[PDB]
Amino acid sequence: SKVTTVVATPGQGPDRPQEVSYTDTKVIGNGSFGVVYQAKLCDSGELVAIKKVLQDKRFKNRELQIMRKLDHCNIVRLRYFFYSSDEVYLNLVLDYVPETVYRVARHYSRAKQTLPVIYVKLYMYQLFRSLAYIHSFGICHRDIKPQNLLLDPDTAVLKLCDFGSAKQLVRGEPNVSYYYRAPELIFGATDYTSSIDVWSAGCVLAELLLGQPIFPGDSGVDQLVEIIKVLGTPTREQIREMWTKVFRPRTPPEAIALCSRLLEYTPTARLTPLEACAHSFFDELRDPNVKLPNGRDTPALFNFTTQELSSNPPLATILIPPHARIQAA
Numbered sequence: 265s266k267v268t269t270v271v272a273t274p275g276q277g278p279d280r281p282q283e284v285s286y287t288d289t290k291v292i293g294n295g296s297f298g299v300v301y302q303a304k305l306c307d308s309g310e311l312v313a314i315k316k317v318l319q320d321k322r323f324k325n326r327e328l329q330i331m332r333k334l335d336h337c338n339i340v341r342l343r344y345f346f347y348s349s350d351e352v353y354l355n356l357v358l359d360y361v362p363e364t365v366y367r368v369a370r371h372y373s374r375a376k377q378t379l380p381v382i383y384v385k386l387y388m389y390q391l392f393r394s395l396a397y398i399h400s401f402g403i404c405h406r407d408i409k410p411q412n413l414l415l416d417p418d419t420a421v422l423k424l425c426d427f428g429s430a431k432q433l434v435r436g437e438p439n440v441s442y443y444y445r446a447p448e449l450i451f452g453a454t455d456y457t458s459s460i461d462v463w464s465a466g467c468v469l470a471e472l473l474l475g476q477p478i479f480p481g482d483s484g485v486d487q488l489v490e491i492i493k494v495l496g497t498p499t500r501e502q503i504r505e506m507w508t509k510v511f512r513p514r515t516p517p518e519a520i521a522l523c524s525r526l527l528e529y530t531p532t533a534r535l536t537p538l539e540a541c542a543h544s545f546f547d548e549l550r551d552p553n554v555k556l557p558n559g560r561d562t563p564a565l566f567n568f569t570t571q572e573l574s575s576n577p578p579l580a581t582i583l584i585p586p587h588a589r590i591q592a593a
């Protein structure tokens with residue numbers, strides 16, 4: 265009922281802007297960092313989300329540059345990107361996903377219930393996969409939160425999105441400090457590793473089990489007070505670097521043991537995406553007789569690339585089970 269034809273450039277491939285048309289535009293996201301709309305392309309009818317951010321010709325949009333080099337089933341797919349209006353607005357046309365870990369987590373909280381563990385595995389595992397993949401590029405998201413984890417209810421696939429706050433960390437360079445904030449950040453680190461993403465993911469896993477934020481605090485103070493109110497006080501040693509009673513009864517040991525190896529004061533002490541993916545908490549996923557709670561076949565959880573594994577290839581023995589190979593032969 266209201267078409268909009270623009271000159272868009274494919275997200276992947278040699279810059280060759282072609283004409284693109286879309287309609288049914290319906291706002292669905294808001295903030296000071298931009299705004300996300302929904303819309304349907306006219307030649308395919310496919311649904312998409314358009315993220316509109318204000319960019320100035322002085323420099324290049326870092327989030328655009330990062331998105332353009334990404335391509336993984338567990339990261340929001342970029343279709344096109346174009347500009348609008350003096351004031352320049354960059355629009356990112358993404359493959360639309362209907363829900364988020366935030367809207368789902370909240371939907372379970374209003375029922376005093378908790379998201380079934382099978383779903384927690386499925387989501388957390390794919391998150392670690394998206395992490396392992398981008399970290400191998402040296403790229404750190406730097407802002408993992410339930411709002412940023414999109415998911416499709418009927419497929420049970422999670423896709424990381426929102427790289428407006430992400431940066432390709434260059435080991436050997438200063439990073440200015442400007443409830444998922446890792447402690448090293450609270451202490452305004454300047455050389456922190458991409459292991460900050462692991463801490464945040466840890467808060468998310470924890471949260472999904474709990475059923476509410478784990479480290480609630482309006483400031484680093486209150487926030488850090490929580491971290492201590494659960495992880496206790498740090499040692500002079502850890503300070504430089506920078507239980508089972510905490511989680512609800514009946515919480516699978518593997519889950520509680522997994523959160524303990526992610527929520528460590530020492531960045532280097534924490535697991536890495538790849539290791540996390542292979543943690544026994546996800547053993548059930550590597551099971552041949554595993555059943556997707558939805559019936560449909562489980563999403564491609566073992567199609568790892570040499571890139572996703574570069575962090576430590578031999579770990580492929582675990583991440584890719586016997587049946588996964590014979591079935592992908």
Ligand SMILES: O=C(Nc1cccnc1)c1ccnc2[nH]c(-c3ccsc3)nc12
Nearest residue numbers: 300313315358359360361362363425426
């Ligand atoms: O990019 C997206 N969202 C976003 C969120 C926060 C900051 N920047 C972008 C996005 C891309 C594709 N499909 C999407 N679906 C949704 C969504 C669906 C229900 S609430 C949010 N958000 C997206």
